[PDB]
Write a protein that binds this ligand. Sequence first.
Ligand code: T82
Lengths: 18, 340
Amino acid sequence: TTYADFIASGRTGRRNAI
Amino acid sequence: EQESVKEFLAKAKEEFLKKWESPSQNTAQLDHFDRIKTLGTGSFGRVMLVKHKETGNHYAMKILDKQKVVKLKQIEHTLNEKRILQAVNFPFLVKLEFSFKDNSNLYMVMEYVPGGEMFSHLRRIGRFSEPHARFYAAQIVLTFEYLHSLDLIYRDLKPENLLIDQQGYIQVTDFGFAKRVKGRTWTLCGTPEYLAPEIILSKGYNKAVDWWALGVLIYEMAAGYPPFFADQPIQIYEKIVSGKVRFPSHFSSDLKDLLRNLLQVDLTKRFGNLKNGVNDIKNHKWFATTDWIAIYQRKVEAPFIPKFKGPGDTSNFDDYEEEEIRVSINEKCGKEFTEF
Ligand SMILES: NC[C@@H](C(=O)N/N=C/c1ccc(O)c(Br)c1)c1cccc(Cl)c1
C-alpha cells in the first residue's frame, strides 16, 4: 500500500531541516 | 469585512516595525529559574521545561551554546529568530517572555505549550479527519497572512514545528529560517518533504513557497503521510518537481481540488500567489464552513484537546538524558552576539 511504502521509506520519525 | 482585515494588518505592521527597530534585551537571568526537564535537544542547543522561582510559572527555555552556534554557522539565524520573536504578536505564534545571555549560552524563555508537537499526535492517531485537518489548516492560513503582510517568509512549516496548546490551538515556535524579504531570495533551506519545487530547482523564490508547504501539511494531516516521500532526499526531490501526486481514495473532491492548486508546480498558477492572494484559499469550497474570524478569536471548539495533568506536565514530550548546563568562567563569542 502507499502506507506500507511510507513505512518502508524509513522517514516516519521527526525530520531534520536540510 | 475586507477593510477590517486591511486595518488590522496595517496596525500589526506598525507595531511589528517599532519592535523590530528597537528590540528588547536582557530581561531575566538564569538563577531566576529551576530546571525541570529536557524537552528537546539539537546540535547547538536544548529546550527545557523550567519553573520561574518568584512566580512558580512554568516556561519553555531554549538554551543555545554560543560556541556551537558559531561552529555550525547559525549566528545570523539565531539573532534573526530572537529579533522576530520579540517583535511579532499573533494568536498562533509562541510568545517570548524573556531573553538573556551569559558567558556560554543564549536563552529565550517562552510560554510553555504542554500539548507537545502536532507530529506526535498525528503519528499516534494515524491521520486527522478532514474537519480536524481543516481546523489546523485555517490557523496556518491566517498565520501566513499575518507573516506575509510583514514580508516574512516562514520556510519551515511541518508538524514537528507546530505545538498544540491547552485549548487545542496551534503555536508556531521556531523562526531560525524565516527571512524578512519583500522580493525574492535564494537560500536552499527547509525540510525535504516540504520543499517547493522552485527551491529544489535553485530558482529565486518568494512567499509562494509557504503556500506550497501548506499544501504538503494539509495532505500529510489528512492522509497520515506526506505527498512526496522516498528513502533519501535526492529521491524526494525528483518526485516533488515531477508535478505528479496521488491522493488516498478517502480524500474529498473539494480537498483534492484545493491541494491541486496549492501543490502547483507553476508558481504563476499556485493559490496564494495570484492577484486575489490569500483570498483564493480562504474562499475555496473546502473552507466553506470555516468562520475565519472565529478561528482568529479562538472561539471555535477544537476537535482535539491534549491530555493535561497540570501546569508542568511533560507527558506529551519525548524523554532525553539530562545533561549539565555549564556556564564557562570565560565569556565566549561576545562580539558575535552583542545584539542578542
Ligand atoms: N523544532 C525544534 C526546536 C524545538 O523543539 N523548539 N521548541 C520550541 C518551544 C517553544 C515554546 C514551547 O512552549 C515549547 Br514546549 C517548545 C529545537 C529542538 C531541540 C533543540 C533546539 Cl535548540 C531547538
